[PDB]
mmCIF file of C-alpha atoms and ligand atoms in Angstrom:
data_model
loop_
_atom_site.group_PDB
_atom_site.id
_atom_site.type_symbol
_atom_site.label_atom_id
_atom_site.label_comp_id
_atom_site.label_asym_id
_atom_site.label_seq_id
_atom_site.Cartn_x
_atom_site.Cartn_y
_atom_site.Cartn_z
ATOM 1 C CA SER A 24 8.036 -21.704 -4.254
ATOM 2 C CA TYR A 25 11.199 -20.964 -2.282
ATOM 3 C CA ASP A 26 12.030 -18.015 -4.637
ATOM 4 C CA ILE A 27 13.369 -15.102 -2.293
ATOM 5 C CA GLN A 28 12.847 -12.592 -5.145
ATOM 6 C CA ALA A 29 9.333 -13.543 -6.366
ATOM 7 C CA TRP A 30 7.540 -11.065 -4.094
ATOM 8 C CA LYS A 31 8.657 -8.093 -6.272
ATOM 9 C CA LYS A 32 6.681 -8.987 -9.474
ATOM 10 C CA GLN A 33 3.835 -10.213 -7.274
ATOM 11 C CA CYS A 34 3.744 -6.739 -5.739
ATOM 12 C CA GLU A 35 3.960 -5.070 -9.150
ATOM 13 C CA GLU A 36 0.927 -7.117 -10.349
ATOM 14 C CA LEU A 37 -1.087 -6.315 -7.128
ATOM 15 C CA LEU A 38 -0.325 -2.584 -7.630
ATOM 16 C CA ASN A 39 -1.607 -2.963 -11.218
ATOM 17 C CA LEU A 40 -4.839 -4.391 -9.900
ATOM 18 C CA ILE A 41 -5.129 -1.602 -7.299
ATOM 19 C CA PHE A 42 -4.635 1.055 -10.085
ATOM 20 C CA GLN A 43 -7.619 -0.658 -12.060
ATOM 21 C CA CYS A 44 -9.864 -0.217 -8.935
ATOM 22 C CA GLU A 45 -11.949 2.996 -9.108
ATOM 23 C CA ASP A 46 -11.631 2.962 -5.254
ATOM 24 C CA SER A 47 -7.830 3.820 -5.546
ATOM 25 C CA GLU A 48 -8.265 7.084 -7.593
ATOM 26 C CA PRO A 49 -8.024 9.352 -4.393
ATOM 27 C CA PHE A 50 -4.880 7.498 -3.153
ATOM 28 C CA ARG A 51 -2.909 7.409 -6.485
ATOM 29 C CA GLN A 52 -0.962 10.657 -6.185
ATOM 30 C CA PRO A 53 0.327 12.834 -3.262
ATOM 31 C CA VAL A 54 -2.708 14.475 -1.459
ATOM 32 C CA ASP A 55 -3.777 18.000 -2.695
ATOM 33 C CA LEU A 56 -2.925 20.582 0.121
ATOM 34 C CA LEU A 57 -4.629 23.395 -1.878
ATOM 35 C CA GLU A 58 -7.951 21.353 -1.497
ATOM 36 C CA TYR A 59 -7.146 20.142 2.037
ATOM 37 C CA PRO A 60 -5.094 22.979 3.687
ATOM 38 C CA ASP A 61 -5.183 21.475 7.223
ATOM 39 C CA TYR A 62 -4.046 17.928 5.919
ATOM 40 C CA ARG A 63 -0.251 18.269 7.004
ATOM 41 C CA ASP A 64 -1.378 19.555 10.512
ATOM 42 C CA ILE A 65 -3.096 16.141 10.971
ATOM 43 C CA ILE A 66 -0.809 13.718 8.979
ATOM 44 C CA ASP A 67 2.944 13.342 9.833
ATOM 45 C CA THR A 68 3.988 11.091 6.812
ATOM 46 C CA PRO A 69 2.025 11.432 3.552
ATOM 47 C CA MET A 70 1.901 8.180 1.381
ATOM 48 C CA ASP A 71 0.187 7.275 -1.905
ATOM 49 C CA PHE A 72 0.262 4.358 -4.461
ATOM 50 C CA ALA A 73 2.495 6.172 -7.006
ATOM 51 C CA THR A 74 5.117 6.668 -4.320
ATOM 52 C CA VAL A 75 4.849 3.013 -3.350
ATOM 53 C CA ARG A 76 5.218 1.884 -7.079
ATOM 54 C CA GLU A 77 8.174 4.344 -7.587
ATOM 55 C CA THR A 78 9.954 3.059 -4.416
ATOM 56 C CA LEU A 79 9.447 -0.619 -5.544
ATOM 57 C CA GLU A 80 10.652 0.129 -9.211
ATOM 58 C CA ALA A 81 13.745 2.071 -7.827
ATOM 59 C CA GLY A 82 14.804 -1.101 -5.856
ATOM 60 C CA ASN A 83 14.336 0.767 -2.574
ATOM 61 C CA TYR A 84 12.183 -1.985 -0.844
ATOM 62 C CA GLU A 85 14.225 -4.882 0.674
ATOM 63 C CA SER A 86 11.074 -7.034 1.535
ATOM 64 C CA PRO A 87 7.332 -7.162 0.950
ATOM 65 C CA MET A 88 6.869 -6.291 4.653
ATOM 66 C CA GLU A 89 8.323 -2.802 3.944
ATOM 67 C CA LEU A 90 5.959 -2.280 0.995
ATOM 68 C CA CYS A 91 3.013 -3.482 3.161
ATOM 69 C CA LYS A 92 3.942 -0.988 5.951
ATOM 70 C CA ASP A 93 3.727 1.946 3.378
ATOM 71 C CA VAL A 94 0.383 0.720 1.903
ATOM 72 C CA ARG A 95 -1.044 0.381 5.438
ATOM 73 C CA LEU A 96 0.112 4.000 6.030
ATOM 74 C CA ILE A 97 -2.040 5.123 3.056
ATOM 75 C CA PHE A 98 -5.021 3.608 4.863
ATOM 76 C CA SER A 99 -4.142 4.808 8.409
ATOM 77 C CA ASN A 100 -3.710 8.385 6.981
ATOM 78 C CA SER A 101 -7.269 8.199 5.490
ATOM 79 C CA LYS A 102 -8.674 6.919 8.896
ATOM 80 C CA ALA A 103 -6.985 9.795 10.715
ATOM 81 C CA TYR A 104 -7.638 12.686 8.201
ATOM 82 C CA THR A 105 -11.349 11.722 7.759
ATOM 83 C CA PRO A 106 -13.736 14.167 9.447
ATOM 84 C CA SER A 107 -16.306 11.244 9.585
ATOM 85 C CA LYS A 108 -16.168 7.331 9.519
ATOM 86 C CA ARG A 109 -19.269 7.578 7.049
ATOM 87 C CA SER A 110 -17.263 9.585 4.569
ATOM 88 C CA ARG A 111 -17.109 8.629 0.808
ATOM 89 C CA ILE A 112 -13.270 8.698 0.442
ATOM 90 C CA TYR A 113 -12.865 6.866 3.851
ATOM 91 C CA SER A 114 -15.269 4.091 2.819
ATOM 92 C CA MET A 115 -13.272 3.734 -0.539
ATOM 93 C CA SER A 116 -10.170 3.257 1.715
ATOM 94 C CA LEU A 117 -11.828 0.466 3.708
ATOM 95 C CA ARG A 118 -12.916 -1.532 0.605
ATOM 96 C CA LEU A 119 -9.443 -1.056 -0.964
ATOM 97 C CA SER A 120 -7.722 -2.150 2.331
ATOM 98 C CA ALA A 121 -9.780 -5.353 2.445
ATOM 99 C CA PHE A 122 -8.814 -6.064 -1.211
ATOM 100 C CA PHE A 123 -5.057 -5.392 -0.503
ATOM 101 C CA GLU A 124 -4.969 -7.507 2.673
ATOM 102 C CA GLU A 125 -6.698 -10.489 0.833
ATOM 103 C CA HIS A 126 -4.000 -10.454 -1.915
ATOM 104 C CA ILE A 127 -0.867 -9.495 0.195
ATOM 105 C CA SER A 128 -1.228 -12.433 2.660
ATOM 106 C CA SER A 129 0.134 -15.085 0.292
ATOM 107 C CA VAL A 130 2.987 -12.736 -0.921
ATOM 108 C CA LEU A 131 4.126 -12.337 2.720
ATOM 109 C CA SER A 132 3.698 -16.052 3.592
ATOM 110 C CA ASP A 133 5.694 -17.204 0.504
ATOM 111 C CA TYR A 134 8.503 -14.706 1.150
ATOM 112 C CA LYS A 135 8.924 -15.575 4.802
ATOM 113 C CA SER A 136 8.794 -19.325 3.940
ATOM 114 C CA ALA A 137 11.455 -18.775 1.174
ATOM 115 C CA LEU A 138 13.715 -16.935 3.678
ATOM 116 C CA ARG A 139 13.324 -19.697 6.316
ATOM 117 C CA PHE A 140 14.269 -22.331 3.640
ATOM 118 C CA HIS A 141 17.409 -20.250 2.734
ATOM 119 C CA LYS A 142 18.543 -20.388 6.494
ATOM 120 C CA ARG A 143 17.455 -24.094 6.944
ATOM 121 C CA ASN A 144 21.168 -25.217 7.394
HETATM 122 O O1 LIG B 201 -6.959 15.000 -1.996
HETATM 123 C C1 LIG B 201 -6.962 13.771 -1.920
HETATM 124 N N1 LIG B 201 -6.301 13.052 -2.843
HETATM 125 C C2 LIG B 201 -5.724 13.532 -4.039
HETATM 126 C C3 LIG B 201 -5.596 14.818 -4.456
HETATM 127 C C4 LIG B 201 -4.941 14.811 -5.642
HETATM 128 O O2 LIG B 201 -4.740 13.486 -6.003
HETATM 129 N N2 LIG B 201 -5.256 12.682 -4.936
HETATM 130 N N3 LIG B 201 -7.552 13.073 -0.860
HETATM 131 C C5 LIG B 201 -7.432 11.655 -0.687
HETATM 132 C C6 LIG B 201 -6.923 11.322 0.723
HETATM 133 N N4 LIG B 201 -7.737 11.902 1.659
HETATM 134 C C7 LIG B 201 -8.536 11.174 2.539
HETATM 135 O O3 LIG B 201 -8.118 10.096 2.893
HETATM 136 C C8 LIG B 201 -9.791 11.620 3.151
HETATM 137 C C9 LIG B 201 -10.544 11.123 4.070
HETATM 138 C C10 LIG B 201 -11.630 11.929 4.182
HETATM 139 C C11 LIG B 201 -11.625 12.887 3.285
HETATM 140 O O4 LIG B 201 -10.419 12.734 2.545
HETATM 141 C C12 LIG B 201 -7.744 13.333 1.517
HETATM 142 C C13 LIG B 201 -8.334 13.745 0.154
#
């Protein structure tokens, strides 16, 4: 497909699948500072899947690369806030990251291919 717009619905569907994963539940809404009072000492830019979905639905992503950067920030924040690489919530992040990367690969490839076809002449 050379459809330059198709990534948006493909990302909406992938976010729906991520919301059906039990592994996403800790990453759905902005982190709880009352539970994790040091969190914002450690993490410069909070990110969560509800923020990503709202940004997409507002029309405030230009490309699936930008959405991918925010989703990867959810996972780097978990890797950097975790007190242990054997932690429950951290291990949930690693499985969910593998699922996300498996699905986003085609979305990025198709978008970049569509843009190259648009600029072919
Ligand atoms: O508090 C939340 N999430 C909430 C709170 C209300 O809704 N979602 N956390 C998820 C993100 N997070 C981690 O990545 C992590 C790694 C090791 C321990 O925690 C900190 C805890």
